Curated annotation (Swiss-Prot), chain A:
Residues 117-234 form the SET domain. S-adenosyl-L-methionine binds at residues 127-129, 164, 191-192, 248. Histone methyltransferase that specifically mono- and dimethylates 'Lys-9' of histone H3 (H3K9me1 and H3K9me2, respectively) in euchromatin. H3K9me represents a specific tag for epigenetic transcriptional repression by recruiting HP1 proteins to methylated histones. Also mediates monomethylation of 'Lys-56' of histone H3 (H3K56me1) in G1 phase, leading to promote interaction between histone H3 and PCNA and regulating DNA replication. Also weakly methylates 'Lys-27' of histone H3 (H3K27me). Transmembrane segments: none annotated. Expressed in all tissues examined, with high levels in fetal liver, thymus, lymph node, spleen and peripheral blood leukocytes and lower level in bone marrow. The chain holds residues 917 to 1187 of 1210 of the full protein. Zn(2+) 4 binds at residues 194, 247, 249, 254. This is Histone-lysine N-methyltransferase EHMT2.
Length: 266, 267
């Protein structure tokens, strides 16, 4: 069967680079049961706090490469190197923002600068659609953001389709989620892998509304061209979904196959 | 004879598509720093802007939105963009395409949201403080820049001391953009009685009608070196003419000491 190109860019020019879609496995058409958005949306009143006078910010007159940068100090157990790659309680990134004295091209601006690597939406053998790299990707490289519809945890609890639901797990305050079922970007198609090669990290950029950390994926290891991207959806997801389907990642250390679940239960 | 110094390579600190340098060949005034440069409007208290994506009117085009079937183009009042992104013209109202539209990010109805494309310079004028001039030919109808600042209420505008950077959106609920403390290059654009740019109300990523954004388009071909200016309006000058008179130098200046003398003479 020929690998068919069925969309030049599922993001319709909204990302820095196109994200084409191909299918060399079956007759499934380009997915159109959702609306592609490049940034989070709301379908009820969220009213993100964007008061510029309440942003924590730095006073750097360099490129924010020094340890004296306040924004770097606010970041929890992680930092960017000279090439914009991430090094590591879960981590938390505070990027520079419109209140900082620094320039838009300072060293603390990786996620807000968007997608740089070539990605492809493709039909997998056993998991539906998936996302793969069309280039080599060094460890620590920003891949993409988990984008979708901002909703409350109360709303998330009553929605029937949770296959694209991301829980932000807020520490202090009410808990919010990003639901990518009806509105989402390329990340909604990233599958679960028990041997993951990307990791999600909470990030603040142009607002510091603690209800709404944004979710950035970074590679956790060097990734080779053609490799499927995947992250660990987490035990909570699988405790819920396993009664409907089990993991087909096929790793030797798969944790969520029928067999693995059986072994955990014994 | 004083010669011109470059005193900042980019007052926007890399936030615009192009750098906006500042020069002074007139006096010893340093790069202005009694404000915070911002490339997009800010809030210091919430305006509760409606950003519900389901409230957006949007089009179904999969072309470049150049057809008359584009709903967004239909919603635009008494104006439209040509194939080069130039504006042609009860003031006009622009509805650009948005994230709910089915079209691509590079369609023909995205001029203002795509940002500054012309080359501008902040410079020291002889009599009007800082001003902004063209560094290139700017054809008639070309987008120049947005009037960016702090979104504030009518009431808040009333209690603020300095209104030299205050723009009334001319609305329902009444709001202003105050560029005194937070603003972009537009805060430095002076009044001209022979204006060469015009402010136009625009909607882009929201359609909260209380909060049009303000886009300047050239009203004629502008040549390199020409100072940019719009008509601030009679309201501004009714207030300000007591404190200073217009220095624009136009043969038909409406607000000079000379013009004021005549008006006070007639009445
Ligand atoms: C599709 C995205 C990947 C799975 C998702 N993972 C995460 O939310 C998550 N959150 C963090 C991570 C991850 C992976 C992290 O890694 C760290 C973090 C701090 C970013 C926090 C998840 O757990 N989703 C989910 C699905 C269903 C649920 O059931 C609820 C609501 C639906 N019905 C009604 C039953 C009740 C609950 C949750
Ligand atoms: C500096 C910017 C240029 C002057 C400014 N012009 C406009 O607002 C304006 N609005 C439109 C235009 C223009 C030029 C248009 O051309 C068309 C439009 C639809 C965009 C609507 C203006 O009129 N400002 C202003 C200043 C003082 C005022 O008095 C208030 C607040 C101060 N004290 C408290 C007294 C009360 C009021 C307003
Ligand atoms: N490791 C996995 N094993 C089996 N199914 C998976 C796995 N990871 C993801 N899936 C499937 O993909 C859904 C999660 C989606 N966010 C991923 C995109 C999905 N593959 C699609 O085609 O739309 C899950 O509900 C499963 O249907
Ligand atoms: N035509 C004019 N004649 C005299 N002064 C002007 C004129 N236009 C603008 N100004 C001055 O500029 C102020 C308006 C500002 N938005 C423009 C930038 C200002 N020139 C500055 O240096 O900051 C007015 O309050 C005046 O001080
Ligand atoms: Zn810094
Ligand atoms: Zn910085
Ligand atoms: Zn900073
Ligand atoms: Zn597995
Ligand atoms: Zn259209
Ligand atoms: Zn369009
Ligand atoms: Zn449209
Ligand atoms: Zn004049």
């Amino acid at each position: 069967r020929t690998e068919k190109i069925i969309c030049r860019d599922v993001a319709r020019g909204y990302e820095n680079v196109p994200i084409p879609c191909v299918n060399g496995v079956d007759g499934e058409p380009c997915p159109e049961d959702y609306k592609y958005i490049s940034e989070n949306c709301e379908t009820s009143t969220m009213n993100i706090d964007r008061n510029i006078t309440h942003l924590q910010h730095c006073t750097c007159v360099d490129d924010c490469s020094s340890s004296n940068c306040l924004c770097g100090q606010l970041s929890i157990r992680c930092w960017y190197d000279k090439d914009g790659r991430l090094l590591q309680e879960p981590p938390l990134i505070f990027e520079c923002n419109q209140a900082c004295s620094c320039w838009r091209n300072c060293k603390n601006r990786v996620v807000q600068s968007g997608i740089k690597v070539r990605l492809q939406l493709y039909r997998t053998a056993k998991m539906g659609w998936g996302v793969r790299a069309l280039q080599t990707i060094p460890q620590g490289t920003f891949i993409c953001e988990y984008v979708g519809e901002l909703i409350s945890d109360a709303e998330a609890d009553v929605r029937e389709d949770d296959s694209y639901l991301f829980d932000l797990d807020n520490k202090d305050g009410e808990v919010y989620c990003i639901d990518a079922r009806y509105y989402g970007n390329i990340s909604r198609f990233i599958n679960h892998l028990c041997d993951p090669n990307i990791i999600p990290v909470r990030v603040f950029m142009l607002h510091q509304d603690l209800r709404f950390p944004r979710i950035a994926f970074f590679s956790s290891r060097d990734i080779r061209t053609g490799e499927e991207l995947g992250f660990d959806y987490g035990d909570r997801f699988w405790d819920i979904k396993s009664k409907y389907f089990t993991c087909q990642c096929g790793s030797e250390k798969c944790k969520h196959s029928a067999e693995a679940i059986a072994l955990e239960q014994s």
